[PDB]
Amino acid sequence: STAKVTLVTSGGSSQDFTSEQTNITTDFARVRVTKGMWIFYQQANYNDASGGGSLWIKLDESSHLMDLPFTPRSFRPVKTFQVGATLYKHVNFGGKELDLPNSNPRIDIGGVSSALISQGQWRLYEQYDYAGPSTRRGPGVYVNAGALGVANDALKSMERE
């Protein structure tokens, strides 16, 4: 497995996950990310109903179990950890995601509103196919579009330098 997290219920029962969970029946209370980077959301489907405005938390690898801030209803790995960038439809990493290991000339996820850049330097464009003005962004956490240097819902292509 390339990403892995352990989750524990208030009653003491544990389960490990290695892939995205759009829904989860079990109520988990404590967490330890053992591989990769994960995002947890208060609502199912990665905070889609709230357009990213419900509670969320991004967690990195850890050596110990600790409390979650809320009971997750969905959670997923950031699959471009150590590879590239992931784009998200909603602020705060919510909604439909799109992984960019490399340049993408035509981004179409219903309007990009946040991003996690793990690796690379990139130029971000508000037209397809690297047309028009661009902004440069490297590794970082970008919880809204303004942080990326683009208008909300406007990112259309992203070139890796």
**Residues at the annotated binding site for Ca(2+)?**
89, 111, 113, 153
Q: Are 21 and 75 in contact (CB under 8 A)?
A: yes
Select 29 or 109, whichever has its Cβ closest to Ca ion.
109
Could you give the residue ranges of the DSSP H alpha helices within the chain? Answer: 44-47, 145-148
What tokens appear for 27 in the block?
């109520």
Considering only 8-16, 74-82, 97-105, 148-156, which stretch makes contact with Ca ion by CB under 5 A? 148-156
Select 126 or 153, whichever has its Cβ closest to Ca ion.
153
Considering only 31-39, 54-62, 96-104, 108-116, which stretch makes contact with Ca ion by CB under 5 A? 108-116
**Residue 82 zone, left/alpha/beta (φ > 0; ψ -120 to 50; rest):** left
- Tell me how far, at minimum, the Cβ of 111 lies from Ca ion, in Å: 4
Select 37 or 112, whichever has its Cβ closest to Ca ion.
112
**What does the alpha-carbon distance between residue 10 and residue 45 come to, in Å, rounded to a whole number?**
23
Select 80 or 92, whichever has its Cβ closest to Ca ion.
92
Helix (H/G/I), strand (E/B), else coil: 47? helix
**DSSP H helix total and E strand total for the chain:** 2, 14
113 binds Ca ion, rule: CB under 5 A? yes
Considering only 1-9, 28-36, 60-68, 145-153, which stretch makes contact with Ca ion by CB under 5 A? 145-153
Give the residue carrying structure tokens 């439909």. Answer: 96
Interface residue with Ca ion among 68, 111, 123, 144 (CB under 5 A) is 111
Q: For residues 35-94, which are near Ca ion according to CB under 5 A?
A: 89
Quote the radius of gyration of the chain (alpha carbons, Å): 16
Binding site for Ca ion (CB under 5 A): 89, 111, 113, 153
